[PDB]
């Protein structure tokens, strides 16, 4: 691994070549059919990234800033692609919610609230800065091992570990890929290397990726709890669809639960500060 100080980090063109930067899955890589099936689906199925990215491009910086100083794989860039399209209203058919998809249970581990107006899964800042920490310890717990950290995040760590040890009192590997996990466990891990091995060389695959500045998008500003998503962006002369899009946690646009805080488009963000007072 190496590091980038915010400096340096300023002089990346675009968010890709950022998060291209600190890739380190990209060595550990092989042929594998399971990869190139992932491969296959992503390129049939074009417009998948591009939507993906179109939303993204709200919240990959943040993502970016975060794994960079935990010095975590830039690969977990992708991960809400995978999980919701980066679409922070995603809700599974097993109730995971958000960029990250927690499920209730996981997210009340993590403290993130659920009320009838707020749900912390949705929270662009809070459900990322849990999702690494909770990838972070399963990386601990899995001796360094990032792929199962992944299947761990998806299954569950008590199913990756009774897999572990299911396979070693057959005397079989308990790497990743040598794992009896359920099928969308299998196929996790194999869709985000496909995935970050397109967006590592996408005119190879004939893809072209939608350019993204390599700037902060939005910024946090403090905002009482009287003050609805509407009046915000009247007094800004924002989009308000823009602002729900920046603060999803917030159901049907309602704001009487959750943090005093709201992110808004940076450019605006020192006007509403001076406006709020
Ligand atoms: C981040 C998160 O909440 N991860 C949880 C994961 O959610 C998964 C579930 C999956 C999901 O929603 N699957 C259904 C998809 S579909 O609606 O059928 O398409 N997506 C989420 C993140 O990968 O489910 C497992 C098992 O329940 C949980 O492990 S356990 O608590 O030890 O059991 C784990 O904590
Ligand atoms: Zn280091
Ligand atoms: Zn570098």
Request: glycine share 4%; aromatic share 12%.
């Given at each position: 691994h190496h590091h980038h100080s915010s400096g340096?980090?300023?002089?990346?063109?675009?968010?890709?070549?950022?998060?291209?930067?600190?890739?380190?899955?990209?060595?550990?890589?092989?042929?594998?059919?399971?990869?190139?099936?992932?491969?296959?689906?992503?390129?049939?199925?074009?417009?998948?990234?591009?939507?993906?990215?179109?939303?993204?491009?709200?919240?990959?910086?943040?993502?970016?800033?975060?794994?960079?100083?935990?010095?975590?794989?830039?690969?977990?860039?992708?991960?809400?692609?995978?999980?919701?399209?980066?679409?922070?209203?995603?809700?599974?058919?097993?109730?995971?919610?958000?960029?990250?998809?927690?499920?209730?249970?996981?997210?009340?581990?993590?403290?993130?609230?659920?009320?009838?107006?707020?749900?912390?899964?949705?929270?662009?800042?809070?459900?990322?800065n849990a999702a690494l920490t909770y990838l972070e310890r399963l990386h601990d717990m899995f001796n360094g091992d990032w792929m199962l950290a992944l299947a761990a995040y998806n299954a569950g760590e008590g199913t990756v570990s009774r897999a572990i040890e299911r396979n070693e009192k057959l005397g079989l590997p308990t790497d990743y890929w040598?794992?009896?996990?359920?099928?969308?466990?299998?196929?996790?891990?194999?869709?985000?290397?496909?995935?970050?091995?397109?967006?590592?060389?996408?005119?190879?695959?004939?893809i072209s990726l939608n350019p993204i500045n390599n700037e902060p998008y939005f910024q946090a500003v403090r905002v009482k709890r009287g003050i609805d998503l509407s009046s915000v962006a009247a007094l800004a002369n924002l989009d308000e669809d823009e602002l729900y899009q920046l603060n999803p946690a917030y159901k049907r646009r309602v704001t009487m639960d959750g943090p005093q805080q709201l992110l808004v488009p940076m450019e605006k963000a020192a006007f509403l500060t001076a406006s709020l007072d």
């Open positions: 340096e980090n300023l002089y990346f063109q675009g968010i890709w070549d950022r998060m291209r930067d600190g890739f380190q899955l990209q060595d550990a890589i092989s042929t594998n059919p399971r990869i190139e099936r992932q491969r296959l689906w992503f390129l049939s199925n074009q417009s998948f990234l591009e939507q993906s990215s179109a939303r993204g491009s709200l919240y990959m910086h943040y993502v970016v800033e975060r794994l960079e100083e935990r010095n975590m794989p830039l690969e977990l860039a992708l991960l809400p692609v995978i999980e919701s399209a980066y679409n922070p209203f995603a809700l599974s058919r097993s109730n995971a919610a958000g960029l990250w998809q927690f499920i209730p249970a996981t997210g009340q581990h993590f403290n993130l609230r659920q009320t009838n107006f707020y749900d912390g899964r949705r929270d662009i800042t809070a459900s990322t040598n794992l009896p996990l359920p099928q969308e466990t299998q196929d996790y891990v194999p869709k985000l290397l496909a995935l970050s091995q397109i967006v590592m060389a996408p005119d190879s695959y004939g």
